[PDB]
């Protein structure tokens, strides 16, 4: 079967730069041109670059302005993307694709059939950081609908996963996109609304996983 | 460059609706014009190509049309996995662009938020920061307001705020917004409230703590 894997993705320093690469494999890699497509959180699709079959034809986007080469080896089956002066409005995650199959020596038809599955790329001064995960609970000064939570507070980069007592509590569970605050760092909510009368009875702990920073955090959430 | 536009920018419909979305271009790109759907936090997936070519293992409900510069997409039977944004993309020259995007969400009766606010943890006030947080709990449609208020005074600049994806059953939104102070400013003030105005409210609705 078609296969394009990527990898290269992390985090980078404004100006600095980063090599993406995608490893092809199940089709013959040289008899199609390939593009790279981005897309930063929350926002659309964004064209970037084309190489073609041969690499003999390669086209940019606007905003790349020379700062970025597409490039591949079709000995090695491999597609690569070098970015050069990166800049924070280049944060997205990065796919490369190429067109549905075709007999043909070069199959170069601008249709994304066959996409990869995505690495993100962060560019910001921030460091890379685990979250503190603080509880959310209401105010101590009982009866209704309550809502619990916990704010996972000040990481670096996405994503951080969470649940709710290792899965099992799944029902009235919300969990929220990150904001990017003016630090130039993300945080996140996530809650369950329970009866009032459970706090007393049952106990709630949220699971925090930050993977960049090998952070995981099981918090407590007590009234 | 080509401009690529779509209409509408987003679009409630209802599971058996037929969906008619257009696209245009800034110039003659023939057939040229693909079409792809995104569901939230997945890979896109080619749907329709050459304007009008249903893409290989792809149903009969979904259809393109047009040539030149204005397309049409179309959904027979609005199904629930099809709730995502589609995009249009064009390959006359380079570069290669999309469309802004159609985002489809499923329509329901309006539904206002319950609401709830949170003080800033005790672990959290261990340092110099405060982050008070706000909940709007599974209200429709996804308009809300929030007004962060201290001691009475209206904040600005200090608050973010997210929604999440629509829910999948019941067809509702829910919004979670942080108010960031200084442990300083928190420790001197008294009474903090989020205030929340929604379609379904016949006035404002105000929770509130006092530290």
């Known amino acids: 079967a078609v296969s394009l894997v990527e990898s290269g993705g992390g985090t980078v320093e404004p100006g600095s730069t980063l090599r993406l690469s995608c490893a092809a494999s199940?089709?013959?890699?040289?008899?199609?041109?390939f593009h790279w497509v981005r897309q930063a959180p929350g926002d659309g699709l964004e064209w970037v670059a084309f190489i073609s079959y041969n690499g003999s034809s390669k086209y940019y986007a606007s905003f790349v302005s020379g700062r970025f080469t597409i490039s591949r080896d079709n000995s090695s089956n491999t597609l690569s993307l070098q970015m050069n002066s990166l800049k924070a409005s280049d944060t997205a995650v990065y796919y490369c694709?190429?067109?549905?199959?075709?007999?043909?020596?070069?199959?170069?038809?601008?249709?994304?059939?066959?996409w990869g599955q995505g690495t993100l790329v962060t560019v910001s001064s921030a460091s890379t950081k685990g979250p503190s995960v603080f509880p959310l609970a209401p105010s101590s000064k009982s009866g209704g609908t309550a809502a619990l939570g916990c704010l996972v507070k000040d990481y670096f980069p996405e994503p951080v996963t969470v649940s709710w007592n290792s899965g099992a509590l799944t029902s009235g569970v919300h969990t929220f996109p990150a904001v990017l605050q003016s630090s130039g760092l993300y945080s996140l909510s996530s809650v369950v609304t329970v009866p009032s009368s459970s706090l007393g009875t049952q106990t709630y702990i949220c699971n925090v996983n930050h993977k960049p920073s090998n952070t995981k955090v099981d918090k407590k959430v007590e009234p | 460059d080509i401009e690529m536009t779509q209409s509408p920018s987003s679009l409630s419909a209802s599971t058996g609706d037929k969906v008619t979305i257009t696209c245009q271009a800034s110039?003659?790109?023939?057939?040229?014009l693909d079409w792809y759907q995104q569901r939230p936090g997945k890979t896109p997936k080619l749907l329709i190509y050459?304007?009008?070519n249903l893409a290989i293992g792809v149903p009969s409900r979904f259809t393109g049309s047009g040539s030149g510069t204005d397309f049409t997409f179309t959904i027979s039977s609005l199904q629930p996995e099809d709730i995502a944004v589609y995009y249009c993309?064009?390959?006359?020259?380079?570069?290669?662009?999309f469309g802004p995007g159609t985002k489809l969400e499923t329509k329901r009766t309006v539904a206002a938020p319950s609401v709830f606010i949170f003080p800033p943890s005790d672990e959290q006030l261990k340092s110099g920061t405060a982050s008070v947080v706000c909940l709007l709990n599974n209200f429709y449609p996804r308009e809300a307001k929030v007004q962060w208020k201290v001691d009475n005074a209206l904040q600005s600049g200090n608050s973010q705020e997210s929604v999440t994806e629509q829910d999948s059953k019941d067809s509702t939104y829910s919004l979670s917004s942080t108010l960031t102070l200084s442990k300083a400013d928190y420790e001197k003030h008294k009474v903090y409230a989020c205030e929340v105005t929604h379609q379904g409210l016949s006035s404002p609705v105000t929770k509130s703590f006092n530290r």
């Open positions: 050459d304007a009008s």
């Open positions: 110039q003659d790109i023939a057939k040229f």
């Open positions: 993309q064009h390959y006359d020259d380079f570069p290669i662009s």
């Open positions: 694709a190429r067109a549905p199959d075709c007999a043909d020596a070069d199959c170069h038809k601008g249709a994304f059939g066959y």
């Open positions: 199940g089709f013959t890699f040289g008899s199609y041109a």
